[PDB]
Design an enzyme around this catalytic site. Structure first.
Site, short mmCIF file in Angstrom:
data_model
loop_
_atom_site.label_atom_id
_atom_site.label_comp_id
_atom_site.label_asym_id
_atom_site.label_seq_id
_atom_site.Cartn_x
_atom_site.Cartn_y
_atom_site.Cartn_z
NE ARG A 1 -2.03 4.72 0.42
CZ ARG A 1 -1.03 5.55 0.15
NH1 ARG A 1 -1.43 6.52 -0.24
NH2 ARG A 1 0.11 5.27 0.61
CG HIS B 1 2.81 3.34 4.10
ND1 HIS B 1 2.59 2.30 3.05
CD2 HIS B 1 2.63 4.49 3.67
CE1 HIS B 1 3.13 3.02 2.16
NE2 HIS B 1 2.75 4.23 2.26
NE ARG C 1 6.03 10.67 -3.30
CZ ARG C 1 4.72 11.27 -3.31
NH1 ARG C 1 3.58 10.52 -3.60
NH2 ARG C 1 4.50 12.45 -3.30
CB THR C 2 1.67 3.94 -2.30
OG1 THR C 2 2.25 4.76 -1.27
CG2 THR C 2 1.27 2.51 -1.61
CE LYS D 1 -24.98 0.19 -8.43
NZ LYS D 1 -24.94 -0.77 -9.46
N1 LIG Z 1 -26.79 -2.76 -8.95
C1 LIG Z 1 -27.84 -3.55 -8.53
O1 LIG Z 1 -28.57 -3.89 -7.67
C2 LIG Z 1 -27.90 -5.07 -9.51
C3 LIG Z 1 -26.82 -4.85 -10.56
N2 LIG Z 1 -25.44 -5.11 -10.02
C4 LIG Z 1 -24.46 -5.19 -10.65
O2 LIG Z 1 -24.39 -5.36 -11.86
C5 LIG Z 1 -23.20 -5.25 -9.90
P1 LIG Z 1 -22.39 -3.69 -9.91
O3 LIG Z 1 -23.06 -2.48 -9.71
O4 LIG Z 1 -21.57 -3.61 -11.38
O5 LIG Z 1 -21.05 -3.85 -8.89
C6 LIG Z 1 -27.01 -3.65 -11.38
O6 LIG Z 1 -25.98 -3.04 -11.33
O7 LIG Z 1 -28.31 -3.40 -12.12
N1 LIG Z 2 1.36 10.59 2.95
C1 LIG Z 2 2.25 10.81 3.48
O1 LIG Z 2 2.81 11.73 4.04
C2 LIG Z 2 3.29 9.57 3.93
C3 LIG Z 2 2.74 8.29 3.16
N2 LIG Z 2 2.86 8.73 1.65
C4 LIG Z 2 2.87 7.93 0.59
O2 LIG Z 2 2.79 6.35 0.80
C5 LIG Z 2 2.85 8.23 -0.78
P1 LIG Z 2 1.34 8.61 -1.59
O3 LIG Z 2 0.57 9.22 -0.59
O4 LIG Z 2 0.92 6.98 -2.06
O5 LIG Z 2 1.67 9.13 -2.87
C6 LIG Z 2 1.51 7.87 3.35
O6 LIG Z 2 0.53 7.88 2.59
O7 LIG Z 2 1.06 7.50 4.57
#
Ligand SMILES: NC(=O)C[C@H](NC(=O)CP(=O)(O)O)C(=O)O
Ligand SMILES: NC(=O)C[C@H](NC(=O)CP(=O)(O)O)C(=O)O
Ligand SMILES: NC(=O)C[C@H](NC(=O)CP(=O)(O)O)C(=O)O
Ligand SMILES: [Zn+2]
Ligand SMILES: [Zn+2]
Lengths: 153, 310, 153, 310, 310
Positions: D105, D134, D54-55, D84
Site C-alpha cells: 500500500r 483498492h 484491516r488491510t 537513505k
Molecule cells: N547503507 C549502505 O550504503 C551500505 C550498507 N547497506 C546495506 O546493508 C543495505 P540496507 O541499509 O540494510 O538496506 C550498510 O547498511 O552499511
Molecule cells: N481508508 C478509507 O477510508 C477506505 C480504505 N480503508 C481501508 O482499506 C481500511 P485500512 O486503512 O487498511 O485500515 C482505504 O484505505 O482506502
C-alpha cells in the site's frame, strides 16, 4: 542581386537573414527570440555545410528585422553569426554583432542569493571581454560571472 | 550643495576618493564640533531585515545626536512583508513616502540597490546587503585607519578570515585601492578566498597583493591587521569545514608587530581574536566601533544637508 | 517536384519530409519530439501557403526515417499531415498519421500525486477519442485528462 | 493453471467479471474447508508505506491461515527508502529477489503499477495506491454484497461520502458495472464527486446512475448503502471545507429501509455513521471487515497456488 | 560441531579464510538443496536500531526459509530503550533469555561487540555497527564475486565512494586480504579515504593497493567495481562537502571494460550509479542483493545447527 554560394540557394524580398550561426544554436534562437511567433514566411537550415566553417545554421524571416540588442544578445550567443538586412532582394545592411556593455531581461543571475530572483525587477549585467572569454557583472549583487555559467537559465 | 547631497550610498564602487575624503573630513569636524540640531525635523527610517548590533544602534544614535527622529524595525517578522507576503519593492515604495532617508540591511545581495529603484527622491543608505557591500563600515574603517596612521596612502594592510562572504573587506579593499601605494596581504582559507572581481580590480590598478597562510608571515610589516569573522550565516553547507576560525590571533603573536600597527575588526568576533589581545596597545576594534558614530553622523549630514560649514 | 517562387530549395536525397503540418505547429513538433537534436541536415519552412490549407509548415529531415508509430505520434498535432519517405531523391512511400493508442515519454502527468514524477520511469498515457477531442489516461495513476491540459516536460 | 495464477492484481479495470467470480467462489470454498498448509514454504512481503489496520492485519492473518511466512514493514520511515533516499523501484527490485509475492500500500497513485515493472516474476498485489484503486477491498465488498443480497446483479446501490478520493468506490463501482443492471446513486459534496472516468465508463455500459443531495431521498429503494470516509490525508487545502462528514447516517434514518438493506463501510469511520446504527439489523460493516479474511485468502490461494482449489 | 557453531559473528577481523569458505560452501549447498525445517523450533530476534531494507528483510526471509520464527523491531523508538531510557546492555540481557540468536544493526560502532558481553550463550550476529563492520554483507559479496569471477584470489578490485565510513568496504577489504594476490584500487574523496588500519593491514600482508582520482583510470583492468554510497548519516558537518556523489558510473564508462567485469553495490545507491547501467551486462548489484539470501541462510545454518550440512 545574386542567388547564393553554397549548394542550396535561397531568395527573399525584405527581411533579416542570420547566417553563420554555430551548430545546435540556431534552434536555440528560435526559442529565446520567439522568432517562430511571427506569421511571416520563415526558412531554417540546420547543420548545413559552411565550407571551412564545418557546419552552420541559418534563419530567414520575411519582412522582419531584429533589434540591435538581439544582435547585442547575439554577440554572446553567436559572435561569428552574420545578420543581414535584406531589401528588394539581396543585402543593404550587412552587420556584425558587437559586444555590448550590458544585457537586460533575458539573463538570470547565477547567484542564488540575488535579490533579483525573489523580486519584480528585470535582470541587468555588464559585459566585459576578459582574458579570452566574456565576463558579466550583476547590477544588483555586483558579482561577476563567466558568460558560460550565466547561460544556464 | 556638497557632492553627496541626496545621493544613494549603495556601494564603495560608486564613490571616489574625493567623496570618501569628504566624509572623513566631516566626521573629523563633527567629532570635535558637535551639531546637535543639524537634522532637526528630519525623520530617518532604520530598516534591518538581518541581525545587527553596532551598525543599527550606532546609526540610530547618530541620528539622535543630530536631532533627527528614527522609525523602523530590527526584524521583518512583524512587517507586512513578513506576515502578509509583501514584496520588498512595495515595502520600499510606501516607506519612501514617510521618511527623508532610508537606512537598510538585508540578507540578499542587491537589496539596497533594488530599493533605490523604488524610493523616488528618498536617498537609500546601505547598512549591508548580503555578502556584497558594507559602505558605512568602510567609511568608519577608513576614519579609524586615518586617525591611527595619519594616512591612507602607502599602507601595509592584512585582511584575515572569511574574505569571500565578508562584505566588510569587499568594500574596504575597493576604497583603499582608490588611494596610492597600498599593499594588501590576504590570509584566508582556500574555500573563502578574496573574490576574483576584487583581485582583477587590484591588477587593473597596478596594486600589490599576495596570499599568505600565516599571520606571522606578515605581522612584521603590517600597519593595519584587519581580522574578520567566518560568515557562518552565509556559508553553503559544502563549506561547513570552514565555520571554525582558521586564524586565531593571540597576544603572543604580536611580538614582531610594528609599534604603530592596529588590529581592527568589524565585529562581532567569535574565537578569531583571543581576549588577551584586548589589553595590548594594538587592540583597536572597540575604538573603531566608536568611530562609527562620527562616520555615520558625517554621512547623514552630507546626504541631508545641502551645505555644511563648521 | 518541389514548389516554385523563383526556384525554391527543399530537395533532399534520403530522409523524411513532414508535409501539410498545421500553421504554428512545426515549431512545437521540433520542440516536443526533439527533432533538431541531430547532426543530420534539416530544412524547415514556416508559414508558407498551400492552397488546400491557408498556410502550412514543412519539416524535412535527412537520412532519418519514422516508423508507422512515430508517424502516428503526430496525430495529436498534425492529424492531416503527410509523411513522405525519401530515398534516392525519390518519394518511395507516403503515409498519414493514425491516432496512436498511447503517448510515451513526451508528456508529463498533470496529477501531482502520481508516482511517475518521483520515480525512474517514462510517462505513458492511453489515447482515447473522447469525442470532443482526445482524452489521456495515465498508465500509472489511472486518472484521465484532456489532451489540452496534459503538459509536456 | 487457474486464470489468476501468478498475476498482478493492480486495478479492477484489468479484471473481468470471470476473475471476480473466481475469487469469490474460491473464498466460499476456503471458508468452508480451510487449507492450513496450502501456501507452506511461501514467504510474502507486507509492505505498507501508508497507514492501515484491516488491510494489513487481515492480509497477514490470511497468509498465516494458509501456512505462509511474512516479512515487511508497516512504515517506510525505517526502510532504506526512508532514511537513505532509495527509489521505490530499487526497493522493489531487491525485495522481489526474496519473496514469492509482494502486497503493498502506497501514498502515491500508480505505485503498485510501478512495482510490477521492477518485480520480475514476483506478483504484486495492490493494498491501495493513493486515491486510485483498492482491488482487494472491492473483492471483500463483493463477497459481502452477495452474502447478504444473494446476487451481484440487479441491485440498487448508493455510494455516499468522498467519491473523488475514495479508491474504495473507484474499484467497487467498476466492479459492479461488470455485472448486469445495477443502479447507482452517488451522494457526495460537489467538490468530492465521483470522477469522470467512472461516469463515462457507466454511460458506455448503459448503466443507470443519478446524483442526490440527501441519503433518505433514496433510502426506500437501496439494497446497499456504501458509506465512505472523507479522505482528509488526500485533500488539498482548497478543499478543506469538505473535511467534516457531510452525510451522517443515523439509526433514525433507517425507518423506511428495505428489509434486505445493509450498511457497508470500508472503514475506518469518523462520524459518518453514528454508533447507534451499530446494533440495528442493517449495520454490516464489521461483518464486512471479517469477510476480508476469506477474500484475501482466496486471492493469495489463486495467485500463489497453481491448481484451482476444491 | 562445525567451526562456526554457536559463534558470535561480529567482525571479519575475527574470521579466517577457512570460516569464509565454510559459509560460501554451505551457501551453495543450501541453494541447491534447501532445508525448510533445518531451524524449526528456533526463535531469532531481528533487532534493527537503524534503517535497513535488504539486510533486515533478507535476514528474516532466510530465517523463514529454514523454518525458524522471528521476533524483534525495525525501530528502537518504541522499545523500552527508546521511551524509558534503558541501556543497550540491559536490553540485550533480557532478549538473550528469550531467543536462540540475536541479529542486530546499530548506529554506534561496537554495539554488536557490546551485546556479546551481555548475551550469555546466545550468539550475536552483526547486521552492521555504525561505520565499522558489516560481516554478512562481505559474505554475500564474496559469494557474488565467486559466482561471477569463479574465484576469490588474484583479482583486481576497485572500491569507489565513501571508504572512511563504509562498513561494507572495511569488512570486504579485510576479507579479500585473507586471499592470495588480490590487487586493490581505492577511488574516494580525500576526506572519505580508506582508514589507516586497513592500509597497514594490507601493507603487512604484502597486498598491493593504489589510490586513483578517476574510475576509468582503472576501468580496463578491474574484475570487480565495488561502488558505495556516501554515508550522509555518519558524516560530520565539516565533511558536508562530500555529501554529493563524486564518482558517478555511467553506462558509457563501461566501453573498455573487461568482459568478466561486474558492477556491485551493497545498496542503496543514490546517483553514484546511473540507471542506464542497470541493463548493461556488467550490472550485478541486484543479483548481489538476492545472493544475500543464500549467504544469510548459510551463516544461520552454521551458527544454530551443530552438524555440517550436506
Ligand atoms: N547503507 C549502505 O550504503 C551500505 C550498507 N547497506 C546495506 O546493508 C543495505 P540496507 O541499509 O540494510 O538496506 C550498510 O547498511 O552499511
Ligand atoms: N481508508 C478509507 O477510508 C477506505 C480504505 N480503508 C481501508 O482499506 C481500511 P485500512 O486503512 O487498511 O485500515 C482505504 O484505505 O482506502
Ligand atoms: N558581521 C560581520 O562579521 C561583519 C559586519 N559586522 C557588523 O556590521 C557589526 P553588526 O552585525 O551591525 O553588530 C557585517 O555585518 O557584515
Ligand atoms: Zn545578481
Ligand atoms: Zn498519472
Amino acid at each position: 542581386m545574386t542567388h547564393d554560394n553554397k549548394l542550396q540557394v535561397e531568395a527573399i524580398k525584405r527581411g533579416t537573414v542570420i547566417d553563420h550561426i554555430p551548430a545546435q544554436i540556431g534552434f536555440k534562437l528560435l526559442s529565446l527570440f520567439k522568432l517562430t511567433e511571427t506569421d511571416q514566411r520563415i526558412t531554417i537550415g540546420l547543420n548545413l555545410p559552411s565550407g571551412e566553417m564545418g557546419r552552420k545554421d541559418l534563419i530567414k524571416i520575411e519582412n522582419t528585422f531584429l533589434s540591435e540588442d538581439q544582435v547585442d544578445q547575439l554577440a554572446l550567443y553567436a559572435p561569428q553569426a552574420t545578420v543581414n538586412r535584406i531589401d528588394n532582394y539581396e543585402v543593404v545592411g550587412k552587420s556584425r554583432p558587437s559586444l555590448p556593455e550590458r544585457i537586460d531581461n533575458v539573463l538570470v543571475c547565477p547567484n542564488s542569493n540575488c535579490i533579483s530572483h525573489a523580486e519584480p525587477v528585470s535582470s541587468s549585467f555588464a559585459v566585459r571581454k576578459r582574458a579570452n572569454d566574456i565576463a558579466l557583472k550583476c547590477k544588483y549583487c555586483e558579482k561577476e560571472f563567466s558568460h558560460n555559467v550565466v547561460l544556464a537559465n | 550643495a556638497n557632492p553627496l547631497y541626496q545621493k544613494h550610498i549603495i556601494s564603495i564602487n560608486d564613490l571616489s576618493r574625493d567623496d570618501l575624503n569628504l566624509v572623513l573630513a566631516t566626521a573629523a569636524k563633527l567629532k570635535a564640533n558637535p551639531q546637535p540640531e543639524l537634522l532637526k525635523h528630519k525623520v530617518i527610517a532604520s530598516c534591518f531585515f538581518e541581525a545587527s548590533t553596532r551598525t543599527r544602534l550606532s546609526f540610530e544614535t547618530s541620528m539622535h545626536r543630530l536631532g533627527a527622529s528614527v522609525v523602523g524595525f530590527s526584524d521583518s517578522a512583524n512587517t507586512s512583508l513578513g506576515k502578509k507576503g509583501e514584496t520588498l519593492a512595495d515595502t520600499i515604495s510606501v516607506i519612501s513616502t514617510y521618511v527623508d532617508a532610508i537606512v537598510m540591511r538585508h540578507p540578499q545581495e542587491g537589496a539596497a540597490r533594488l530599493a533605490t529603484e523604488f524610493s523616488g527622491n528618498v536617498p537609500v543608505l546601505n547598512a549591508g546587503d548580503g555578502s556584497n557591500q558594507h559602505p558605512t563600515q568602510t567609511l568608519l574603517d577608513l576614519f579609524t585607519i586615518q586617525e591611527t596612521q595619519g594616512r591612507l596612502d602607502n599602507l601595509h594592510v592584512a585582511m584575515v578570515g572569511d574574505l569571500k562572504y565578508g562584505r566588510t573587506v569587499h568594500s574596504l579593499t575597493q576604497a583603499l585601492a582608490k588611494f596610492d601605494g597600498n599593499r594588501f596581504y590576504f590570509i584566508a582559507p582556500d574555500a573563502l578566498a578574496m573574490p576574483q572581481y576584487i583581485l582583477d580590480m587590484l591588477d587593473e590598478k597596478g596594486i600589490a597583493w599576495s596570499l599568505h597562510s600565516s599571520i606571522e608571515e606578515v605581522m612584521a610589516e603590517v600597519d593595519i591587521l584587519y581580522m574578520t569573522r567566518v560568515q557562518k550565516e552565509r556559508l553553503d553547507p559544502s563549506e561547513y569545514a570552514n565555520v571554525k576560525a582558521q586564524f586565531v590571533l593571540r597576544a603572543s603573536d604580536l611580538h614582531n608587530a610594528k609599534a604603530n600597527m592596529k588590529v581592527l575588526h568589524p565585529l562581532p568576533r567569535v574565537d578569531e581574536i583571543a581576549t588577551d589581545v584586548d589589553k595590548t596597545p594594538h587592540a583597536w576594534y572597540f575604538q573603531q566601533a566608536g568611530n562609527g558614530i562620527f562616520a555615520r553622523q558625517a554621512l547623514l549630514a552630507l546626504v541631508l544637508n545641502r551645505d555644511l560649514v563648521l
